[PDB]
Amino acid sequence: PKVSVIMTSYNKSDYVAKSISSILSQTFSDFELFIMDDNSNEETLNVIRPFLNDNRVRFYQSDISGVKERTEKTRYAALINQAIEMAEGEYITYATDDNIYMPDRLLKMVRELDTHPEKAVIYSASKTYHLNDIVKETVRPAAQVTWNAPCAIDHCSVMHRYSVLEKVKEKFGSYWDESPAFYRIGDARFFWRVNHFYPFYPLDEELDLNYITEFVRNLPPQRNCRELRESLKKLGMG
Numbered sequence: 001p002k003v004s005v006i007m008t009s010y011n012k013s014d015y016v017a018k019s020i021s022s023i024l025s026q027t028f029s030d031f032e033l034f035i036m037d038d039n040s041n042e043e044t045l046n047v048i049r050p051f052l053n054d055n056r057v058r059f060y061q062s063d064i065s066g067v068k069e070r071t072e073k074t075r076y077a078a079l080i081n082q083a084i085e086m087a088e089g090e091y092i093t094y095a096t097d098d099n100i101y102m103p104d105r106l107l108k109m110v111r112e113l114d115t116h117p118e119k120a121v122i123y124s125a126s127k128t129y130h131l132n133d134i135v136k137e138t139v140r141p142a143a144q145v146t147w148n149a150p151c152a153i154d155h156c157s158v159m160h161r162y163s164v165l166e167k168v169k170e171k172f173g174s175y176w177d178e179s180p181a182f183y184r185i186g187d188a189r190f191f192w193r194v195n196h197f198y199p200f201y202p203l204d205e206e207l208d209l210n211y212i213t214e215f216v217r218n219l220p221p222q223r224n225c226r227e228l229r230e231s232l233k234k235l236g237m238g
């Protein structure tokens, strides 16, 4: 496949079907979809199940259980790394169990990277609808090329060439950072590693959507966005 879509899933039974469906109906259909379920409850697994009949889906379920295991690593980062090691696509993109892809998302992102060989990481705009009908609508824009993506660009808004993962692993020893000190902002930490070598190029269109309507006590102290943004400003790549 041209594209490997890596989705992480953990106990969001009321949302995961809409997420998975949004990927499976894309107008660009030449992808493999990894569904990396982190040993979810029965209800979640029962919602996911019918989608496994789609021949593009690559379903992997962890054996993880209990607070020690759930807090030893940033779990979604661990599952993404496992899927990266199995991916066959030239382009890599990420999805979650409560985020929806707009219908031409893969088409538009594949076209941008196909047309601009000099761009290695692209990002689109994203929209979040707050429900209470809609009480509020937020948009995270994609207006400029940026060497400082952490906490400005979401997990679900990017696509990058597979070759980006090589540089990152060479410097840092892994792709995403499994350290549990980056549990809350794992996407920012991976973008932080990418920003050591590449800027993020914008695609100014809203191509992903979010709807908002003992574990915590065992994680270590969470590192924050300001720390990541200040280290990239100090690194001065742009």
Ligand SMILES: O=c1ccn([C@@H]2O[C@H](COP(=O)(O)OP(=O)(O)O)[C@@H](O)[C@H]2O)c(=O)[nH]1
Pocket: 007, 008, 009, 010, 011, 038, 070, 075, 076, 079, 095, 096, 097, 184
């Ligand atoms: O034990 C867990 C908890 C969460 N996640 C996944 O990590 C991703 C990001 O997490 P979450 O949605 O909880 O965070 P937020 O949207 O608040 O950044 C999602 O795809 C979850 O399915 C996971 O694999 N294992």
Ligand SMILES: [Mg+2]
Pocket: 098
């Ligand atoms: Mg969420």
Ligand SMILES: [Mg+2]
Pocket: 155, 184, 185, 187
């Ligand atoms: Mg987040």
